[PDB]
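In the previous chapter we treated chains in isolation. Here, by contrast, the input contains two separate entities that must be folded as one system, with a combined length of 612 residues.
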Amino acid sequence: MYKCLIWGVNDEYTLAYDKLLFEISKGNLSIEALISKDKYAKYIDGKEVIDKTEISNYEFDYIIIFNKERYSDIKNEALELGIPERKILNGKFFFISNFDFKRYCKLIENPITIISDDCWGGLVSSYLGFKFNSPFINFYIHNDDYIKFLENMDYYLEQELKVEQEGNVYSCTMPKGSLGTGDNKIILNFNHQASFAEAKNDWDERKTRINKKNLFVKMLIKDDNEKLVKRFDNLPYKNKVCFHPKPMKYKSVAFFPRYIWRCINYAARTSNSNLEQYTMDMSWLEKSCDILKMLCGEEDFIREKX
Amino acid sequence: MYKCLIWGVNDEYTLAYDKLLFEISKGNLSIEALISKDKYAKYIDGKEVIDKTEISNYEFDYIIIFNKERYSDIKNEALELGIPERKILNGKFFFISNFDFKRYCKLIENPITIISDDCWGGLVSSYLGFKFNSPFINFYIHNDDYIKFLENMDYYLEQELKVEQEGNVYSCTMPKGSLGTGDNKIILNFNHQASFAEAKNDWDERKTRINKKNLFVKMLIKDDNEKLVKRFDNLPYKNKVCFHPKPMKYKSVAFFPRYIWRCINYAARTSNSNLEQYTMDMSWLEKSCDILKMLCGEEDFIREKX
C-alpha cells in the first residue's frame, strides 16, 4: 500500500477520480496532497493543493501525473526537483482496462522482464508504460528454434550475436542474427532495424537488463503441435503463458474464445487465422484477459471462458 | 463535363465548396441546382434551392450527396424518387487527395475492374467508394502463380474453383482453392473467408463482374526478381503497374521513395520491409502517388521521384 501525490487536477484528474476512489477503497493508495501550477481552490476533494516547492514537506511513494500532453514537461520539473524518476507515474495508465494499482506497481518495483518469440512483449511493455527490461524487442524467432532457447537460456545468452544476413531494403530483406553454432544454432529475424550492426547494438545492451527475479515467458503456437505445447508446458519457468488456437489440457496454454469468434464472424476482420495479430492488439487482448493479473503471475486472468 | 445537382448544402457542402469551384474551373462540371429538405435560403452561391420532388425538372448526369452520416438514407429516397442508382454519387469522396471529377466519373461510367495479387484492389475500391467489380478480393496469389494466371487469364477464369485445403480455425489454417490442373494449376489463398464454401461463393458471384473493357492489373514483387518483372512488363494489358522496392528500367514498375525512407527512418514503423503494408495503406499510397491518375492509366501518376 502506498502514499501518493497527484500532480494535475483537471480533466484527466476528475476523469480518473472514480478509479482513484476504487483504488483507495481497495487500500492500494492514499492521496497526500495535490500539486498544481494554478490554484483553483485551497482544498480539492478534501486535499490541500500545494506547490512543487512545498512537495518536500510530504512523505510519498509516487507522484502520479494527470496531464496527457504536458506529461513530459512535468516529469522534468519533477526530476529538476530532485525526485528520482522511479517515483514518477504517468497516471494515464490508470485508464487501462482492468487496472489495479498494486499489481501495476508490483511489476514496476520488481521489473517484469518479458520474453517473447515476437513483438508481443515490446507492445505490452508500451501499453503499460513499462521500460524494456529485456532484449526481445523488434524481432521474431521460429517456434522450432525458440523452444530450444527457453530450454537452455543462459548458454545462448552468453553467445555473441553473429550476423546470418545483412539485410537490404531494396529486396525487402531484413537483417538476421545468429546465436549458437552447431546444428543447435539459433536465428533472430530482426524486422525493425535497418542494419544488423544496429540490431546487435540494441541486443547486447538491453540484454544486460534481464531481471531473473521476475521473468514472464510467452510463446505463440499457431498450428497443431502438441509436441511443442507439451514441451513448453514443461519449462521450469513459474510465470509463463502460451497462446493457442484451441484449448489444451496443458495449464500454460491460453486460448481466447473471442479470437475464434472474430476469425469467422467479425465483419471488418482483417484475417481468418492471424492469432498473433489478435494477441498483439491490446483492444482484443484486454477483452480476452486481465493483462495486469496475468503478468503478476496470478491465475484466472483469462476473462472469457468455456 | 457533366451537369450535376447537389443534395446537401451544409457543413460538408461548404467544406467542399472550394473543391467544387476548382472542379468547375477545370470545367469538369456545373451545378444546375441545390436539393435540400431544410429551406435555409432561396439561393445558395447563386444556385437555386429546390426540393426532392422538383429534381425531375432538370437534366443532369449526377446527383452529388453531401451528407456522410445519412448518405444511404438520401440515396434510398433518391432511388425511391425513381433515380438511376448509377447517377447517385457520394460527395465525401471529393475529399480524397488529388481528386478530379472527370477521372472519378470515368472509373464509374466504364467500371474499372482491378485485378490484383492481394487485398490491394479491394482496399482501393473502398477508398474510392466503388463496388467490387472484380473477384480478386481478400485472398492472395504468389508471384509465380499470379504471373502464370495473368498470361492465360481466360482459361483460368473459365475453370471451376476446387478446394485445395479445407480451412480450420483451430490451427490457423485458411481455406485454399485452385484453378486449372497439372502444370497449369494455380493456388488462391483465402484470408478473410473462414470456409472454402464461403470463398467459392464470393468468387463465383463476383467473377461475373469482370469488365474486360477496363482492366487494371497490379502486382507486387518484393524480392530481387528481374525475370518476373520483365515478364510483367510484357503483359498486353494496356493499364498495369508492378510495385517494387527499387526503380527499374521497366515502365510497369512503380518505386516509392518515401517507402525506403519509412523503412530506414520512420520511428513507429512496424517492419523494415513491408512494401505490401505500405502499398495497401491509402494514407501512404496517396502520398507516394496519384491513385486516380494511376487507375485512369495516365502516365505521371507518381508524385515523389528520386
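Chain A touches chain B at residues 167, 169-175, 190-194, 222-224, 245-246, 260, 263-264, 269-275 (CB under 8 Å). Chain A has twelve helices and eleven strands. Compare these points with the single-chain example from earlier in the chapter.
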